[PDB]
Structure formats: C-alpha cells, structure tokens
Symmetry: C5
Subunit: 221 residues, 5 copies
Amino acid sequence: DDDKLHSQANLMRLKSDLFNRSPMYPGPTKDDPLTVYLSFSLLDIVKADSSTNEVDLVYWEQQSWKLNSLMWDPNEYGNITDFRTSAADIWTPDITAYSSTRPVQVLSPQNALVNSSGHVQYLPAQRLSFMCDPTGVDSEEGATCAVKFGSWSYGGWEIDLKTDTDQVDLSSYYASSKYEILSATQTRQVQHYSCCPEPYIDVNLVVKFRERRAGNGFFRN
Amino acid sequence: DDDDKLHSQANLMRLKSDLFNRSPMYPGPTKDDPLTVYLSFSLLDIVKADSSTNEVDLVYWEQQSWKLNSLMWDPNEYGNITDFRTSAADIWTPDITAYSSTRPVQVLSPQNALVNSSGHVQYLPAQRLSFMCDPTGVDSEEGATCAVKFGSWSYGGWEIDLKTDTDQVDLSSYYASSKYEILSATQTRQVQHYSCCPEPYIDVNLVVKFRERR
Amino acid sequence: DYKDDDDKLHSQANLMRLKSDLFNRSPMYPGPTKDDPLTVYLSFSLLDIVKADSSTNEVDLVYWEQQSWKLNSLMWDPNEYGNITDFRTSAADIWTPDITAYSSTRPVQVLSPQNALVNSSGHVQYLPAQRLSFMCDPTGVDSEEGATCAVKFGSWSYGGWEIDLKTDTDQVDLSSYYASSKYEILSATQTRQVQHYSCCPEPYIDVNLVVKFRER
Amino acid sequence: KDDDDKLHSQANLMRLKSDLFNRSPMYPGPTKDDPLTVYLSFSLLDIVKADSSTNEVDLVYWEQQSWKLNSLMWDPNEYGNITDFRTSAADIWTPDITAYSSTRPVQVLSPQNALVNSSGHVQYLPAQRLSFMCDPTGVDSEEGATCAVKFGSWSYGGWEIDLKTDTDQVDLSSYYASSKYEILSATQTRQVQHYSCCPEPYIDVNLVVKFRER
Amino acid sequence: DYKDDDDKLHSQANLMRLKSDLFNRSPMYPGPTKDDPLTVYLSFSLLDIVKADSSTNEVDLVYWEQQSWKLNSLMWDPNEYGNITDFRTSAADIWTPDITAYSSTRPVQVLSPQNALVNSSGHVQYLPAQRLSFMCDPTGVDSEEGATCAVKFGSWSYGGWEIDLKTDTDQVDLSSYYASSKYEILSATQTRQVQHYSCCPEPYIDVNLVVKFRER
Ligand SMILES: *[C@@H]1O[C@H](CO)[C@@H](O[C@@H]2O[C@H](CO)[C@@H](O[C@@H]3O[C@H](CO[C@H]4O[C@H](CO[C@H]5O[C@H](CO)[C@@H](O)[C@H](O)[C@@H]5O)[C@@H](O)[C@H](O[C@H]5O[C@H](CO)[C@@H](O)[C@H](O)[C@@H]5O)[C@@H]4O)[C@@H](O)[C@H](O[C@H]4O[C@H](CO)[C@@H](O)[C@H](O)[C@@H]4O)[C@@H]3O)[C@H](O)[C@H]2NC(C)=O)[C@H](O)[C@H]1NC(C)=O
Ligand SMILES: *[C@@H]1O[C@H](CO)[C@@H](O[C@@H]2O[C@H](CO)[C@@H](O[C@@H]3O[C@H](CO[C@H]4O[C@H](CO)[C@@H](O)[C@H](O[C@H]5O[C@H](CO)[C@@H](O)[C@H](O)[C@@H]5O)[C@@H]4O)[C@@H](O)[C@H](O[C@H]4O[C@H](CO)[C@@H](O)[C@H](O)[C@@H]4O)[C@@H]3O)[C@H](O)[C@H]2NC(C)=O)[C@H](O)[C@H]1NC(C)=O
Ligand SMILES: CCN1C[C@]2(COC(=O)c3ccccc3N3C(=O)C[C@H](C)C3=O)CC[C@H](OC)[C@@]34[C@@H]5C[C@H]6[C@H](OC)[C@@H]5[C@](O)(C[C@@H]6OC)[C@@](O)([C@@H](OC)[C@H]23)[C@@H]14
Ligand SMILES: CCN1C[C@]2(COC(=O)c3ccccc3N3C(=O)C[C@H](C)C3=O)CC[C@H](OC)[C@@]34[C@@H]5C[C@H]6[C@H](OC)[C@@H]5[C@](O)(C[C@@H]6OC)[C@@](O)([C@@H](OC)[C@H]23)[C@@H]14
Ligand SMILES: CCN1C[C@]2(COC(=O)c3ccccc3N3C(=O)C[C@H](C)C3=O)CC[C@H](OC)[C@@]34[C@@H]5C[C@H]6[C@H](OC)[C@@H]5[C@](O)(C[C@@H]6OC)[C@@](O)([C@@H](OC)[C@H]23)[C@@H]14
Ligand SMILES: CCN1C[C@]2(COC(=O)c3ccccc3N3C(=O)C[C@H](C)C3=O)CC[C@H](OC)[C@@]34[C@@H]5C[C@H]6[C@H](OC)[C@@H]5[C@](O)(C[C@@H]6OC)[C@@](O)([C@@H](OC)[C@H]23)[C@@H]14
Ligand SMILES: CCN1C[C@]2(COC(=O)c3ccccc3N3C(=O)C[C@H](C)C3=O)CC[C@H](OC)[C@@]34[C@@H]5C[C@H]6[C@H](OC)[C@@H]5[C@](O)(C[C@@H]6OC)[C@@](O)([C@@H](OC)[C@H]23)[C@@H]14
Ligand SMILES: *[C@@H]1O[C@H](CO)[C@@H](O[C@@H]2O[C@H](CO)[C@@H](O)[C@H](O)[C@H]2NC(C)=O)[C@H](O)[C@H]1NC(C)=O
Ligand SMILES: *[C@@H]1O[C@H](CO)[C@@H](O[C@@H]2O[C@H](CO)[C@@H](O)[C@H](O)[C@H]2NC(C)=O)[C@H](O)[C@H]1NC(C)=O
Ligand SMILES: *[C@@H]1O[C@H](CO)[C@@H](O)[C@H](O)[C@H]1NC(C)=O
Ligand SMILES: *[C@@H]1O[C@H](CO)[C@@H](O)[C@H](O)[C@H]1NC(C)=O
Ligand SMILES: *[C@@H]1O[C@H](CO)[C@@H](O)[C@H](O)[C@H]1NC(C)=O
C-alpha cells in the first residue's frame, strides 16, 4: 500500500516539474506555430427564437494540440503516461464562436488531459446563443444555420486549425429535443483580408434542422 | 473550562495547518491509485417543466463521499478531534457532472465539506439543474419520464469508480406542494464501453417519472 | 486646529492597530467544534414579497436577516486601544456562519454591502439584506384566508453540537415592510426547531419562518 | 528629450500613488471620534421599466459621492505639481451608501474609478441600474405616479457618517428625451431618522420622483 | 527536427524574456496625465441588432470595438529580443482605457477572449466583441424611413487633456453585419465630438455612434 502513496508522489512531482518550475508557455508565434484540431458533437438545439433571430445550441467541442514543453519521460515518473489537470494550469487556445450573441456558458468541469508526448485534449461542453434565422424550421425542409469558430487574436501563421472529419458527431444528439437534426458538417475554411498578408482559418459549423414531430406514444432513448 | 476551549480551538487550527500547508493537494486519482466515489440523490423540487424548449429544472441535494489516505490523522494528537468542516476549495473534489444539463448548474448551498479522521470526505452540494427532458405526458395519469446521467467528466472507470448505496432516490424531503408529484425516482449505476477504448466508463442514471399535481 | 488634526490622526492609528492585532496576529477562527460550540442568534425583518409564481410554485421575498455570535478571539480591552469599544469591518475579514435557506430555488442574492459590526466583548453583528426565491404554493393568495408558506434557515454543514441557533423573539419584524407591496402580510413567525434523524445521534437546529399573506 | 519630461511625470505620479497607498495602511473608515461627511447628488438618466405586476421600477442614474480624507492629502510641490489623479476605486476606501428599498443587486454600468485631489477630496461617480420597490399606479394618468427610495450608509450611524446634498433638485439635464417615461419632478432631500432603541441619529437622502408615461 | 526544436525553445525564451521585462520589471503605467496625454483611436464594426424593445425603449446591439493607442513604456528594440516585433497577451496584463457607453441600460457583456496585440513601437490593439443594451426608441422601425438611434462612447473619468479620442473613418464597418438579422442597417456613422461644460475649462471627447435601421 506504500505503492499508492508512491504513484501519488510521482504525479505531484511531475506536475510540479511541469507547472511550478517553468514559466507558462507564451502561446504560439510565427516562429513557433501550432496546429489545433477541432471537432464537434451536437447535443441539443434547445431554443430557436424567431423574434430575435437567435438559436441556442448545446455541444461538446473537442480541442487538441501539442507542446514540446509538456513532454516528459514516463520512466522517470514511475510510468505515468498521462494525467488530468485543471485547464487553468495550462495554456489553452483562444478559439471562439465569431457569431455568438451572448457570452458562451461552460457546462462541464474545466480540466484537460495531457500525455507524455505533449498532447493536450480539452473537451468543454458549452451552451451557445448565435445569430440564426430559423425561418422554415416549421417545415419539412427545415431551416439552415452556420457559425464559424476560430482564434480571436491569432492568424494562420501562428495557429492553424484542422478537423479530423467533416461530419459533426450526432451520435449523442438528444432524441427527444424539440428539434431534429437533418445534417451537421464542420469545414475548415481559409479567409484573407486586403490589409493583411497572412491567412485566417476558421471551422464552419453548418446545421440543418426542423421541428420534431412526434406520434402519440412513448419515445424511449 | 474556558481555557480548555481555547486549546480545543488551537487544536483545530493545528490540524488544519498540518493537513493543508504541509504536503501538496491530492492530484486526483490515477490508474494505479484509483478512487471510489459514492453518489446519492435527494430530490427536493421539480420547479419547472418547459414544453417550448424541452428542459426541466430540478432542485436536489447530491451527496458525494470518498476517502483519501492523505486526509487521515490520529485524533489523539489533535485533542480528540475526529472531524471538521472546511471550505471545499481547500480540498480535491471529484469532477462529477450532469451529462445532459442545458445551463450551468446553480449552487444553492455554501460549499463546505466534512472531513473525518479516517480520511473520508462528505460533500453535499444543493443544486438547481436544467436538463434535457421532454415533458409530454406530464398531464396524464401515466405522467412524464426523464433521465439524466451523472459521472466524471474527465476520468474513466479505472481512475474513478462510481457507486450508489441504494437504487432508491431519497424522496423524504420532496416538497409536498410542488406543481409536480413524483411517481418514481431511481438512481442506477451503469457501466458503458466505447469501441475506441478498453476502459469501462461509469455513470449513475437518475430516472424520474412525474406528473402535474391533481 | 492642528490639535484636532493630530487627534483625528491618533484615533485612526488606534483603530488600525486594533484591527491588525485582531486579524494579522492569529490564524482566522477555524469554526466551532463539539468541544467549543457557538450560539448563533437569528432574527428576520420582512421587507417585500415581490412576486408569487403559481406556475412554478415559487415566491420571491426581500428581507433582512440579523445574525450575531460571540468569539473569544474577537475580544479586546478598550483601554489598550484608545477607548474604542467597537468597529465596522468587511465581512471578508472575519469568520461568518454558514446559515442558508433550506428550500431556496435560486442562489440567494445579497442586496447590501457586506460589512459587520464587532464589539470589545467579541460580539459580531451582521445584517445582510437579501432576495430569496423559495418553494411556496401560493394557492389562496387571492382569498381572504390567504396563503401560508414556510422556509427553514440553518447551518448547512454544522449540526447542533457545533452551532446552536436561537431567536431573540418569535415575532418577525414587520415594521419596515413596504406598504405598497402587491401582497400584505397577515402574519409572520420565526421559530427555533430541533430535528433528529434515525441515522444520526446529533440533533439538527433550524429556525422556521412562517409567513401568511394575501393580495393587497 | 521631450519623452524624458513625460517619463519624469509618470515617475512622479507613480511615486505619489506609492506614497499614498503602499506607504500606509488603508483608512479604517470613520468613527465617532473621527466622523466623515459624504456629499450625495443624483442625475437621473432613464426610467427603463415600471412593472405593475411586481411593484418594482428600474432606474438608470449616476450617483455622485464625494468626501475628504486628511490621509489623501499631499503637497503638489513635492510631486511635480500633480494636483489630482484618477485611480481604481478598489485602491481607496469608499463609503457603504446603499439604496434601502432595492429588490435586486444594483448593477454597475460604469468603470469603477475615482478622482482624488491634493486637498484630500475624493470624487466617485458610479452609474447604476437599480430595481426598487415602487407602485406605478397612476403612471397612465396626467397626475402621474410618485416613488421614493432612501439612500444612506448600511453600517454607520449619523455620529460616524453624515450625509449632505449640494441641492434638493435632482439633475435632469441628462435624462433620456425618448424614454418611455417623462419626469414631472425629482427631489433629493436629506432626512434625520430616529429609532426608540438608540441615541444615535441615522441620516438618509430621500429620492422622490414623479413620472408618467410619455 | 531536433535542432529545429532547439530554435523553437530559444524563441519561446525570447518572448518570455520580453514580457518579463515589460511587465514584471516596472510598476504599472498609472494612466495618462495632462503632461503625458494619450490618444485613443476608436472604430466600430456592427455585427447584429439582436432586439429592439419598444416596451422599454432599449435596443440590443452586438459589435466589435477596435481600440488602439501607444505607450512609450511598451516599446522595445526587436534586436535585443530575437527579432520579435509583436506579441499577443492577456488584456489583464496591460493598462486599458476606461472607454464606456454613456447610455447603456445594462452591464456590457464580453463575447470574445480578452487579449491584445502589442508591437515594438509601443502600439496596442485591443478588439473586444460586445453585446450592449442602450437607450433607444425604436419607433418607425416598421416603416420605410426606419428608426434612428445614437449612443456615445468615451472615457468615464478622463477629460480631453488626458485622453484624446479619434476615429480613422466616419463610416462604421458594415462588412461583417449579419445578412439574416431581423433588422437591416440603412446607415451607421461614428463621429468624434467635443463636449464643453460651463463649469469646467477642460474639454471632454466622445465618439457618437449613430445607427439608422429597420425591420427586414
Ligand atoms: C527581423 O525581422 C524583419 C521583418 O520580418 C526581417 O526583415 C525582412 O526579412 C525578409 C527576409 O529577408 C524580407 O522579405 C524578403 O523580401 C525579398 C524581396 O525584397 C528584396 O527585393 C526587394 C525589391 O527589390 C527591387 O525593387 C525595389 C523597389 O521596390 C528596387 O529599389 C530594387 O532595385 C529592386 O528592383 C528590395 O526592396 C529588398 O531590399 C531591402 O531588403 C534587403 C534585405 O532585407 C536590403 O538589403 C535592402 O537594402 C532593402 O532594405 C530586397 O532586396 C524576397 O525576395 C524574399 O523572398 C524570398 O525568401 C522568402 C522566405 O524568406 C520566400 O518566401 C521567397 O520564396 C523568396 O525565396 C523575402 O520575402 C523583408 O523584406 C525584410 N525587411 C523588412 C523591412 O521587412 C529581418 O530579416 C529579421 N532579422 C533577423 C536578424 O532575422
Ligand atoms: C456586544 O454586543 C452584545 C449584543 O450585540 C452585548 O451582549 C450583551 O451582553 C450582556 C453582558 O453579558 C448581556 O447582559 C446579561 O444578560 C443576562 C441574561 O439576562 C438577559 O436576557 C435574559 C433572557 O434573554 C433576561 O433574563 C434578562 O431580562 C431582564 O434584565 C434586563 C436587564 O439586564 C432587562 O432589560 C429586562 O427587562 C429584564 O429585567 C436580560 O434580558 C444576565 O443574566 C446578565 O446579568 C448579570 O450581569 C450583569 C453584568 O453583565 C449585572 O449587571 C447583573 O446584576 C447580573 O449580575 C447580564 O445582564 C446582554 O443580555 C447581552 N445582549 C445580547 C447578547 O444581545 C454585549 O454586552 C456587547 N459588549 C459590550 C462590551 O458592549
Ligand atoms: C482581432 C480580432 N479578429 C477577429 C476575426 C473575426 O473573424 C470573423 O468573424 C470571421 C473570420 C472568418 C470568416 C468569417 C468571419 N466572420 C465575420 O467576418 C463576421 C461573422 C460573425 C463571421 O463569422 C478573427 C480573425 C482575425 O483576428 C485573428 C480578424 C482579422 C485580423 C485583421 C482583420 O482586419 C480586417 C480582421 C479583424 O477585423 C482585425 C484585424 O486587424 C488587425 C478582426 O477583428 C476580424 O475581422 C473579421 C477577424 C480580427
Ligand atoms: C472527456 C469528456 N468525456 C465525457 C463523457 C460523457 O459521457 C456521457 O455523456 C455518457 C456516459 C455514459 C452514458 C451516456 C452518456 N451520454 C451520452 O453519450 C449523451 C448523453 C447526454 C449522455 O448522458 C464522460 C465519460 C468520458 O470521459 C471520462 C467520455 C468518453 C471518454 C472517451 C470517449 O470517446 C469515445 C468519450 C468521449 O467522447 C471522449 C473520450 O475520448 C478521449 C467523452 O467526450 C464522452 O463521450 C460521450 C464521455 C468523454
Ligand atoms: C450536510 C447537509 N445537511 C443539510 C441539512 C438540511 O436541513 C433541512 O433541509 C431541514 C432541516 C430540518 C427540517 C426540515 C428540513 N428540510 C428538508 O428536509 C426539506 C426542506 C428543504 C427543509 O427545510 C441541514 C442540517 C444537516 O447538515 C448539518 C443535515 C442532516 C445531517 C445528516 C442528516 O441525514 C439524515 C441530514 C442530511 O440529510 C445529511 C446528513 O447525513 C450525512 C442533510 O443533507 C439534511 O437533511 C435534511 C440536513 C444535512
Ligand atoms: C445595520 C443595518 N442598518 C440598516 C438601516 C436601514 O435603514 C433604512 O432602511 C431606513 C433608514 C431611514 C429611513 C427609512 C428607512 N427604511 C426603512 O426602514 C424601510 C425602507 C426600506 C427604508 O428606506 C440603515 C441605518 C441603520 O444602520 C446604520 C439601521 C438602524 C441601526 C440600528 C437600528 O435598530 C433599530 C436600525 C437597524 O434595524 C439595526 C440597528 O441595530 C443595531 C437597521 O437594520 C436598519 O433599520 C431600518 C437601519 C440598521
Ligand atoms: C466622472 C463622470 N463623468 C462622466 C461623463 C459622462 O459623459 C456623458 O454622459 C456625455 C459626454 C459627452 C457628451 C454627452 C454625454 N452624455 C450625457 O451627458 C447624457 C448622455 C447619456 C450622454 O451620452 C464622461 C465625461 C466626464 O467625465 C470624464 C463627465 C463630465 C466631467 C465633469 C462634468 O460635470 C459637469 C461631467 C460630469 O457631470 C462630472 C464632471 O465633474 C467633475 C460627468 O458625470 C458626466 O457628465 C455628463 C461626464 C463626468
Ligand atoms: C468517517 O466516515 C465514514 C463514512 O463516511 C465512517 O464509516 C462508517 O462507520 C460507521 C461505524 O459506526 C457506520 O455507521 C457506517 O456504516 C460507515 N460508513 C459507511 C459509508 O458504511 C467512519 O466511521 C467515519 N469515522 C468517524 C465517524 O470518526
Ligand atoms: C505597430 O502598430 C502600428 C499601428 O497600431 C503601426 O503603425 C501604423 O503604420 C501604418 C503603416 O505605415 C501607418 O498608417 C501608421 O503610421 C500607423 N498607424 C497608426 C494607427 O498609427 C506599426 O506598423 C507597428 N509598428 C511596428 C514598428 O511594427
Ligand atoms: C498522446 O495523445 C496523442 C493523440 O491521441 C497520441 O497520438 C499519442 O500516442 C499519445 N501519447 C502517449 C504516450 O500516450
Ligand atoms: C480612555 O478613557 C479614560 C477615562 O476612563 C481617559 O482617561 C483616557 O484619556 C481615554 N483614552 C484616550 C486615548 O482618550
Ligand atoms: C478638490 O476638490 C474640491 C471639490 O471637491 C475643490 O473645491 C478643490 O478645488 C479641489 N482641489 C483643491 C482643493 O486644490
């Protein structure tokens, strides 16, 4: 049972070495660029407001990246290959929804997973209000909306974005939602501004949805 | 007698300082240092059920308990203190969360925890929760049925194992004049597997059947 | 006069010296224990019943809650500190009890600066003004007999062997109640209660606030 | 060269702030032996909402507060002739003035910073949105509705803090011309309150506003 | 590449070194004075008119507000810092101006991470995205001429001798305005104004944002 206090001490020592004994990573630069992978799972479309043209979505947004400053040798740490930590202990990217109408709300505990090769996985669940015209949601063809995500302060030469797939994950979508999903895609886009040389990257989340019509009966999920 | 109670008070200051200021905070469980967390619910009120958004608002107390070796002490060195209350910010707490909440949880009680000499912690946040629920049927005799799963957000079953003492949600505090009456409320431990990973994942499924008070 | 100015200066330095000896000398009070229990006195003054929602069965109440307790670690000899017999300070500088409404439906909102009064015998007086939403069925509010609701207040984490709760009176103070409120108060009472549970030896104390009210 | 003088005046300001704030313990607040006079004045910006279902009204206003501390004085000659500065309100003591009949926490609409001058005067001007207890009945007639809310210290009696007003007329010059509600009059009046339990008098400023639908 | 990783490490150290020298090596900037006046450039990009409330005469606007200024104490020689000419940093790490909307009815809400760009000549660029409720009478929004509203922005505590405000253009940027908004913009202008008060010698500067809009 002295093995247990031992591995606890190894973890404590690892985090102290990583966090306490080095200054926090200052973020990416044009000389030290970063790639952030984004992926979305849509959970629920909660509300569509046709008087303001705002829609409210609940989703999980997976973010991952890699820092050399987060690497270690599992063998000096008693074979710890990964650990959970508070997101406040690490640098995280400034990714944001460009068309939000209210401050995004965080639904999940804010913690991340770091492994020995320096990879970070951060998966905040969020509630978002964003600009969307729901017109046609009460029909069978439904309504279509889009919101773009990306760094607020960094261009493409500092932070690049990529997605693993263009399919947004619907496997967790709430089956009894007021709204059913017809389709959801997530697409990397490159934009330029005349005033500036560098590219700007965003991931475009496009959702087609309609009012769910129920039969009379219990729909179980 | 009044000079004993000053020692008593100094004994706790000393115990608190020895636990909290001497080693670092517990950095969560690991695969080879896993932790069991007991979870149990007491439902207070169903406040609102919204047909327009399909969200329901529950008020409840969520009882969490676990045990840490680093929180143990010998009461004889501490003036026979067997336990104390402390701010929850002073201790590690599990990341248990409702998977299908639609709004940030609202905290209805001061956040303090009880720690006892064998290192067991008792944490009892009272909360208001909005979660995804379709209230249809709430006006029938059969009523409406909703489910919300709770568990660790970031830790798997090899790190945090999750348990209940009973599969019965505690109704003894449920508000008798609520707009909604409770037909049944259950809390069931479930084990889940993802094809992506060998690790089992644990949740407690809170299932509630309810209808408008008639 | 620079004699008056010096006087002012010396008296400020005295209060500063008192506060520094109390607060910066010994670690903050760790809270009460079985061997060192604390008595907390509660009293309520009702200000407005702002609304009653019959769709959710919630009521919103504005009130002032007076809390007071004594700590030996807050005591001083006024002779050593310029004849200061008391002072006002931020509620953050001192231990406060964990008293909470057991049947709130939303986090309680604090309406007043959070400051407390401390006296040389170690007594603390703290009067937060608050707005609370709590579970109440306001059926009958539209009839002469009115509606009745109750909410219990007490320590969330400390049982009766640690914190003992008491009331000055069993009569809620109505003297500051808003005369133009949508609801008039038929009566309000505040009563200490002691509860025991099969599971546990320790008694649990609360103060039970019962308000009977109807539309103006 | 010119950048040198500017650099010097910055150093001067920083030196003054350090001497005032870092080089001494903050003012403990007023006492019976060291009382403080606080000047209060109101400018009404907008009556936003009048809710007849709850009897609450929502006002946007700025509240001017000023007082003088000997411990904020300095000789401009030792400070590069700085006669005043702007500072964060957290850096200095501010009085506990409060609306006694508020129904929700006041919302702060302006950056919280104060102006301090060499003679020790502080000027602090928070812009606020306030919901308070008011019965709007009559708001739909030509006579209008009347409402009053009292402002004063929460924790200090008249022997510690004394309130004064510059004038009994509330400043309307900034009132929003297109507001849903028109102002017939607004007065701000110092009042002395007595309670049976206590020798100490209690001071407040009573803000009375007559208004009607525009 | 392994030596390529040494170079990245070195560049991280350079930036960390830079920030440490700017921030931890001096007391905070105390803000502007009449002897060290400051010019702030303001520009607006209109995003959405979310809601026009005719029962309260409040309108809710989503916009980006670009603020730019220059501090001598933020300058550095890139040659001493590995040729870094700019960096991003948390807005909390720097002084920021007190610019505020004078006719807001609710606290402004921040929609974007608060970080700023600083470059070697001492220029800062801060671009908060915000949602603002302000006093506006939406009458005529359902007609052809539409409705017209205006809100003034400027320093809350500094006069013209300390903070001067400019705009680069009198034209609000509409290129990002949501095409599907409930409301379409007929025009938006942003104009520097100089306010004078009888009581005071010092002028007070503001930027007046005027928006003419109607139901789509
Ligand atoms: C610190 O950072 C700074 C800023 O990042 C950096 O300075 C810049 O460095 C880069 C890399 O050197 C420069 O970008 C390059 O530009 C090259 C083209 O410019 C050359 O040709 C220009 C045009 O000449 C014609 O036109 C003019 C009229 O316009 C006319 O008078 C001429 O006669 C001629 O007809 C010319 O203006 C320019 O001359 C300037 O710069 C040189 C050297 O810097 C200097 O000697 C001169 O006196 C004068 O100041 C120059 O001759 C371009 O070819 C090159 O692109 C190649 O490499 C890139 C990758 O680097 C590839 O993408 C591409 O495929 C090519 O292979 C590159 O884009 C930039 O112009 C520098 N200067 C400034 C101010 O931005 C420093 O180097 C950094 N310091 C350190 C220590 O790292
Ligand atoms: C700091 O602040 C707190 C309050 O915020 C102050 O607390 C007070 O402390 C004093 C001193 O301990 C208390 O006085 C004592 O009271 C007890 C109990 O009797 C009181 O309450 C009883 C029921 O609640 C009741 O029997 C009594 O009623 C009668 O008596 C009072 C007059 O005292 C009268 O007003 C009533 O009409 C009744 O006739 C009474 O309410 C009492 O037993 C103590 O008595 C003895 O000791 C005193 C000297 O202390 C002596 O003079 C007597 O002869 C006797 O020997 C004592 O009177 C008071 O109750 C506390 N009030 C509280 C807690 O709110 C505290 O004093 C402040 N400190 C300082 C330094 O200012
Ligand atoms: C700092 C704020 N920032 C937010 C921006 C905002 O981007 C977007 O909203 C956006 C991006 C790609 C495609 C469409 C976008 N978009 C819109 O343009 C409106 C709508 C809400 C939306 O989704 C992110 C990228 C870049 O900053 C890294 C910006 C660009 C960099 C450059 C560009 O100026 C033309 C542009 C900025 O204007 C400011 C900068 O000037 C220094 C910026 O505010 C955003 O412009 C859209 C754009 C800059
Ligand atoms: C990090 C966030 N986290 C939240 C999750 C969320 O879990 C659930 O929502 C859930 C769990 C059991 C049963 C039903 C669940 N569920 C749903 O799946 C939708 C509905 C709202 C709901 O309640 C907790 C457990 C685990 O993390 C410890 C997750 C799984 C671990 C693994 C799994 O990937 C296949 C899965 C994650 O996708 C991410 C991970 O990849 C590293 C995760 O986001 C959640 O997936 C549902 C699931 C992970
Ligand atoms: C820590 C949370 N705490 C809140 C409680 C809550 O108290 C009440 O809600 C309550 C008390 C007396 C009478 C009625 C009460 N009540 C209700 O039960 C419903 C309604 C909201 C209400 O007012 C305060 C006192 C004590 O904690 C010091 C509790 C008791 C201690 C003991 C008791 O268990 C039987 C009881 C607790 O259940 C938990 C404990 O077991 C771990 C507790 O959650 C509360 O029980 C009501 C009760 C505990
Ligand atoms: C500490 C909180 N405090 C708020 C009070 C509240 O003041 C008012 O509400 C008020 C003041 C003057 C005129 C009318 C007032 N008033 C009302 O009383 C109802 C309505 C909301 C309103 O505006 C401020 C002044 C004094 O505090 C320095 C109080 C008085 C000091 C003394 C008085 O006891 C009778 C009175 C207090 O009751 C408590 C105290 O006991 C130590 C107090 O809570 C307030 O009483 C209204 C009154 C005390
Ligand atoms: C400190 C608070 N402050 C906010 C003010 C508020 O500014 C405005 O509201 C404003 C400014 C320019 C033009 C129109 C303005 N305005 C209005 O006045 C009403 C309407 C809402 C609006 O936008 C900012 C500028 C200056 O402070 C730097 C003020 C002026 C400086 C001077 C002026 O006194 C006459 C005036 C102040 O009254 C207080 C001061 O006394 C020291 C002030 O509160 C604001 O007056 C509008 C005005 C001062
Ligand atoms: C510390 O806490 C645990 C529970 O959190 C206590 O364990 C209990 O032991 C008592 C023996 O009287 C039993 O009532 C329970 O069955 C045990 N708990 C559980 C969950 O089964 C332990 O005794 C506590 N130590 C004390 C009280 O000092
Ligand atoms: C730092 O940023 C400033 C702008 O904030 C840049 O200065 C601008 O340069 C452009 C192009 O020459 C000119 O229009 C003006 O001289 C500047 N604009 C403003 C607002 O002053 C500058 O390029 C940057 N400095 C360095 C050296 O990188
Ligand atoms: C860490 O995570 C990355 C991303 O999934 C993975 O490719 C890598 O193999 C992991 N490293 C270790 C040692 O676990
Ligand atoms: C305190 O009071 C005593 C009288 O009891 C007096 O002699 C003394 O001067 C006072 N102390 C101060 C500092 O005023
Ligand atoms: C400081 O403020 C007061 C008014 O509050 C004014 O009378 C005075 O002139 C100012 N400065 C001084 C006294 O030098």
